[PDB]
């Protein structure tokens, strides 16, 4: 049987108090009749209002980034600050951070490890560029990214990790992977985890797909054996996010 | 006469709800009997609680960083989000961001300009490294940094700008500038502003000193003719921040 699915909303750098409140009210009103962990990753500014207003028990709130430790890091937010604030889920190594904000495989790996050590559930992101996909190097690239994360974890730590596989070229572009492409990518990640870490870990691991997921394409993607839910960008700011939740069965 | 002084607390990446609440209660209880703009720059996570709890009218709250626009920038916070959230002051181009987080002179300048255009009061940071100071290149370096900011502003925009001069080698190191060094740096910045922008602008501009300011050294620094207050790191997390406020006269 698949492990528990996840439907994660990555709001990215977006939202007004009014527009996020309206969306949160929709989520609070939504009937969810199967076991799925819903996640809302808001900007840091919006965490207070999202914690106060989101009350649907199938939802948890997440941060979109952190640094490992408090200290002289003007502009940044640390894991102890988020932990003190009652935020226990986090997205780390998103493509945008790897591309724009200097996060190498090893930097991502170190953030993931600090977050797991702090007690967080972590959605760790991996995925190849268009050039890498064109060159047929998807597997080596994504397995190198995950091997970097794995290097800094113990086997027991995987109970706290979720992988989001998001091809860079699929993010925000309207180019969604076909169900067969998503399935093969997730399968190859899982096979690596089974072989390098453990079969038990591999079977329990949630591997989520992200990159132009919407209410119309989600259900077909979810039917693939190795897909355990979604990390959703643009569509997570819209009512159709609830159709993506419904798609996780 | 000097323009209105500023005493700005840069909390950096620090604080628990409990420890910041205790400090805010101290600030709320503090008698401030002269005209000084106090600023508290908290992490993004803490803005909600600081807005709710800080009620002393001589204080405003600030963000420690932003990006110009909302959109697909996972982990980041934009100026429209802060504006919607009622935060109207911001620190930009802090040394830590220039050193760790890829902010060039031109990136800082563009953030400053977007923030002024959005309606923010901006504390824009400039300052030279130890090597630059040793080589006698302080003036050219800091004037190059400020010229980059100035390039993206109109003269009328300066009513919204405050400069924080913070030698990199003075930050967190316990190496405070002597009053004469601070005075000459501020004087040379002001002279440049007078000559390149306008004498009126130069006279109204707040130039704050930062780098190991504490309750013991603040009053002597403030007595210098071209010093208009302080950007305070480590000491702003401590009761002695109130002694720095008292020093601005």
Curated annotation (Swiss-Prot), chains A, B:
Catalytic residues, chain numbering = 94 (electrophile), 166 (proton acceptor)
Check the record and name the InterPro entries matching this protein.
Aldolase_TIM (IPR013785), TIM_sf (IPR035990), TrioseP_Isoase_bac/euk (IPR022896), Triosephosphate_isomerase (IPR000652), Triosephosphate_isomerase_AS (IPR020861)
The domain of life for this entry's organism is Eukaryota
Return the Pfam families for the record.
Answer: TIM
Alphabetized UniProt keyword annotations: Gluconeogenesis, Glycolysis, Glycosome, Isomerase, Peroxisome
Q: What else is known?
A: The enzyme contains a high proportion of positively-charged residues in beta-barrels V and VII (compared to the homologous regions in other triose isomerase sequences). Since 2 clusters of positive charges located at precise distances on the molecular surface are common to 4 glycosomal enzymes, it has been speculated that this might represent a signal for entry into glycosomes.
- What does the entry give for GO biological process? gluconeogenesis; glyceraldehyde-3-phosphate biosynthetic process; glycerol catabolic process; glycolytic process
Q: Please give the family membership noted in the entry.
A: Belongs to the triosephosphate isomerase family.
Q: Which residues bind substrate?
A: 10, 12
Query: What is the catalytic activity of this protein?
Result: D-glyceraldehyde 3-phosphate = dihydroxyacetone phosphate
Q: From which source organism is this entry?
A: Trypanosoma brucei brucei
- The identity of this protein, by name, is Triosephosphate isomerase, glycosomal
Write out the GO cellular component annotations.
Answer: cytoplasm; cytosol; glycosome
Q: Which GO terms describe its molecular function?
A: triose-phosphate isomerase activity
Location in the cell reads: Glycosome
Q: What is its EC number?
A: 5.3.1.1
The pathway that the record names for this protein is: Carbohydrate biosynthesis; gluconeogenesis; Carbohydrate degradation; glycolysis; D-glyceraldehyde 3-phosphate from glycerone phosphate: step 1/1
Record carries keyword rRNA-binding: no
Cross-referenced HAMAP family: TIM_B (MF_00147_B)
Its quaternary organisation is:
Homodimer.
């Amino acid at each position: 049987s698949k492990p528990q699915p996840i439907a994660a909303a990555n709001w990215k750098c977006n939202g007004s108090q009014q527009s996020l409140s309206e969306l949160i009210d929709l989520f609070n009103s939504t009937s969810i009749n199967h076991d799925v962990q819903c996640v809302v990753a808001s900007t840091f500014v919006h965490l207070a209002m999202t914690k106060e207003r989101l009350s649907h028990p199938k939802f948890v709130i997440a941060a979109q980034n952190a640094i490992a430790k408090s200290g002289a890091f003007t502009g940044e937010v640390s894991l102890p600050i988020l932990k003190d604030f009652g935020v226990n889920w986090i997205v780390l190594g998103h493509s945008e951070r790897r591309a724009y904000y200097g996060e190498t495989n090893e930097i991502v790996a170190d953030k993931v490890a600090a977050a797991v050590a702090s007690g967080f559930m972590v959605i760790a992101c991996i995925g190849e560029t268009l050039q890498e996909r064109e060159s047929g190097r998807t597997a080596v690239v994504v397995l190198t990214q995950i091997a970097a994360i794995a290097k800094k974890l113990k086997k027991a730590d995987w109970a706290k990790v979720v992988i989001a596989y998001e091809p860079v070229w699929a993010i925000g572009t309207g180019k969604v992977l076909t169900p067969q492409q998503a399935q093969e990518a997730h399968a190859l990640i899982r096979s690596w985890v089974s072989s390098k870490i453990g079969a038990d870990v591999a079977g329990e691991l949630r591997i989520l797909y992200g990159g132009s997921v919407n209410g119309k394409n989600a259900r077909t993607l979810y039917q693939q054996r190795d897909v355990n839910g979604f990390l959703v960008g643009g569509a997570s700011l819209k009512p159709e996010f609830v159709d993506i939740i419904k798609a996780t069965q």
